[PDB]
Amino acid sequence: RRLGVRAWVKENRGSFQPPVCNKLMHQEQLKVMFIGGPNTRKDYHIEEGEEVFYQLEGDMVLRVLEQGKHRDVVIRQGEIFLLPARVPHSPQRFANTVGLVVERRRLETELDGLRYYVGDTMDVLFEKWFYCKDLGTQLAPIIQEFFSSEQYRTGKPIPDQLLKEPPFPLSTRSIMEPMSLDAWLDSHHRELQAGTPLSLFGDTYETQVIAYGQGSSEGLRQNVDVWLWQLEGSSVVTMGGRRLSLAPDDSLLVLAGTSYAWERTQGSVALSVTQDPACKKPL
Numbered sequence: 001r002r003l004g005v006r007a008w009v010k011e012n013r014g015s016f017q018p019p020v021c022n023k024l025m026h027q028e029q030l031k032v033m034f035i036g037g038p039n040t041r042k043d044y045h046i047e048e049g050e051e052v053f054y055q056l057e058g059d060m061v062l063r064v065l066e067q068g069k070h071r072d073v074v075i076r077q078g079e080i081f082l083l084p085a086r087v088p089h090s091p092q093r094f095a096n097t098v099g100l101v102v103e104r105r106r107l108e109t110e111l112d113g114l115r116y117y118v119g120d121t122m123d124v125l126f127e128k129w130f131y132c133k134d135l136g137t138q139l140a141p142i143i144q145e146f147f148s149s150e151q152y153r154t155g156k157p158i159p160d161q162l163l164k165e166p167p168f169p170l171s172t173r174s175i176m177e178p179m180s181l182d183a184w185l186d187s188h189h190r191e192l193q194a195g196t197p198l199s200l201f202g203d204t205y206e207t208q209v210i211a212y213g214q215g216s217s218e219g220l221r222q223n224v225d226v227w228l229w230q231l232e233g234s235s236v237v238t239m240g241g242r243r244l245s246l247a248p249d250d251s252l253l254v255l256a257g258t259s260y261a262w263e264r265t266q267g268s269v270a271l272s273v274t275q276d277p278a279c280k281k282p283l
């Protein structure tokens with residue numbers, strides 16, 4: 001069950017380049033995916049859940065539509081960033097890079113969208129909305145459809161092929177600045193090692209990425225998955241009658257409906273990643 005993150009990336013190296021630049025490490029309630037390049041594109045993904053971006057190897061550019069403006073969000077190696085719900089985003093990836101993206105299984109009620117815009121404007125050229133189960137797989141025919149369309153050929157939209165309005169309001173939020181994960185962890189070393197687990201992004205998001213130093217934790221049975229990633233030092237997770245030693249860079253997925261006990265050593269640093277749909281933000 002324990003997976004060394006860079007060891008898993010090495011074993012699956014060939015997956016992080018064209019034609020399919022991604023491989024899911026975990027694919028149940030929590031989608032833990034690793035993506036490579038090159039992949040330069042104009043499609044904008046829209047979803048009701050949030051997306052955690054971390055650059056393991058090399059840099060990437062996340063193009064976003066923020067408060068009526070086009071913005072390029074540069075995410076450098078070692079940087080972490082959280083995208084809120086319903087923000088249109090277009091990830092740009094380069095050769096020999098590896099990024100981690102964390103997203104969640106959609107609720108039966110949630111719709112995903114894919115949009116292409118007219119030139120550099122906010123006018124929609126082409127769009128398709130769908131119920132997402134396996135994103136990359138469902139996106140491929142929509143993209144092929146776009147490249148075969150009158151819309152792509154002419155650069156002009158077909159009004160009858162556009163929705164009157166999106167199925168939900170698009171985000172009105174200001175987009176955060178990506179931050180160095182290591183710099184953030186070192187700056188909060190005193191609070192972390194005093195036994196205070198800390199949320200990287202706070203309570204205004206559904207997602208909870210929490211940093212832990214030395215201490216004890218009890219994981220209760222939840223209807224959501226939890227991904228643990230040991231960054232520095234070691235810890236021990238007691239789960240399903242087994243004691244699993246997490247060495248530096250080891251990760252463990254705690255499946256929904258499983259309880260655990262976590263014992264972290266002095267000077268150790270680890271993360272937990274949770275995207276509980278019950279924590280979805282209103283408005």
Ligand SMILES: [Zn+2]
Binds near residue numbers: 045046047
């Ligand atoms: Zn996305």
